[PDB]
Amino acid sequence: TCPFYKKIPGTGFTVDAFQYGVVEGCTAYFLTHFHSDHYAGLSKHFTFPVYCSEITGNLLKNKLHVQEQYIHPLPLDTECIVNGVKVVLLDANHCPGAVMILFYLPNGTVILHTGDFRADPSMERSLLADQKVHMLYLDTTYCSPEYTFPSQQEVIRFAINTAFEAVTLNPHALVVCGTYSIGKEKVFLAIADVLGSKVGMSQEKYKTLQCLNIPEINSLITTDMCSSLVHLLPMMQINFKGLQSHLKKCGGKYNQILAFRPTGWTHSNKFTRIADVIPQTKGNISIYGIPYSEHSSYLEMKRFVQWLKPQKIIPTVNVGTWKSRSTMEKYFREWKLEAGY
Ligand code: NI
Numbered sequence: 001t002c003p004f005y006k007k008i009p010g011t012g013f014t015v016d017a018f019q020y021g022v023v024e025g026c027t028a029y030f031l032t033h034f035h036s037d038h039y040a041g042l043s044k045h046f047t048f049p050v051y052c053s054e055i056t057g058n059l060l061k062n063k064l065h066v067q068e069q070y071i072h073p074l075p076l077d078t079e080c081i082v083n084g085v086k087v088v089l090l091d092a093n094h095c096p097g098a099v100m101i102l103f104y105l106p107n108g109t110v111i112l113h114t115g116d117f118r119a120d121p122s123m124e125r126s127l128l129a130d131q132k133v134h135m136l137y138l139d140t141t142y143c144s145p146e147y148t149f150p151s152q153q154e155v156i157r158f159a160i161n162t163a164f165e166a167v168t169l170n171p172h173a174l175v176v177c178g179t180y181s182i183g184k185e186k187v188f189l190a191i192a193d194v195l196g197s198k199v200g201m202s203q204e205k206y207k208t209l210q211c212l213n214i215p216e217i218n219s220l221i222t223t224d225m226c227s228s229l230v231h232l233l234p235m236m237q238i239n240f241k242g243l244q245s246h247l248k249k250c251g252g253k254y255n256q257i258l259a260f261r262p263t264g265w266t267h268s269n270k271f272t273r274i275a276d277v278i279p280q281t282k283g284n285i286s287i288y289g290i291p292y293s294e295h296s297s298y299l300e301m302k303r304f305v306q307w308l309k310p311q312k313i314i315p316t317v318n319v320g321t322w323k324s325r326s327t328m329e330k331y332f333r334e335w336k337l338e339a340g341y
Contacts, residue, residue, distance in 0.1 A: 032115025033098035034059040055097025058211035092117040095183030113137040119296040119304035136310040141295040149291040163191045173256040178238035192230040200228030262292040309341040
């Protein structure tokens with residue numbers, strides 16, 4: 001049974017609600033982004049209208065085989081009428097194709113559902129500037145002040161400088177980057193650009209990247225592993241055993257691996273600056289964990305919410321424990337008293 005925080009009152013609509021069977025009353029199912037916790041339940045046998053971005057629609061058709069007749073793509077930043085209700089899709093600054101949804105209810109209530117997002121000051125100059133929001137359905141993944149991490153630009157700078165130094169010292173080093181979902185593509189694209197290489201990967205991953213509308217993608221990626229000195233591998237293989245096994249397969253072309261694991265936040269963020277990050281090393285293999293986040297930090301979240309001034313907040317992450325729920329409610333009240341709304 002579908003939980004309350006996935007239903008939009010006063011509508012026939014649900015958000016990210018495909019794992020509950022046929023939801024009673026639902027005439028349109030919205031999907032914010034193509035991550036498995038959110039699409040859980042969709043397949044080629046789905047027969048209800050799905051509303052989403054163009055990029056999400058490419059992935060539903062090619063990767064999950066949903067039939068074309070049930071995929072409804074909408075442009076961003078554009079007022080659209082769906083089943084008699086005005087909606088707008090906004091870029092979420094999450095993974096490719098990820099959106100927030102603004103719903104203009106027939107009674108005059110305005111609701112924003114963030115999906116998953118990384119709040120940014122640029123959002124304060126979207127179509128959100130123009131009007132009031134009564135209810136905010138909020139991605140609260142990192143809603144606690146311990147959750148700190150650097151900008152995505154600082155992280156990429158570290159990765160580019162690290163890879164370029166290592167391969168200039170040893171032209172026989174291979175770079176490997178882990179992946180397990182869409183998102184975080186800048187990590188491997190930026191490193192391959194500094195090295196003058198295409199990114200090599202499996203046919204399955206190549207297929208996924210070809211759905212993302214990235215400009216000039218055919219110039220940037222390949223399935224010919226022998227021609228590339230940046231390889232992608234599943235995240236589960238980014239360990240000393242898996243990397244050893246990979247280096248064997250490269251026919252004596254390489255004598256060293258430098259690997260990256262993009263994570264979210266980890267507790268070593270509570271001690272170490274990005275500049276001071278060091279790898280784990282065994283013999284001719286080194287592994288960097290780098291804190292490349294596609295979710296808001298606590299301070300980014302707080303800023304966004306204090307600017308929007310919603311009347312009510314409904315968390316969509318960390319909702320399963322009383323301790324989490326109580327912690328989040330406390331910070332919402334602090335934020336409101338401090339800003340005066
Ligand atoms: Ni996500």
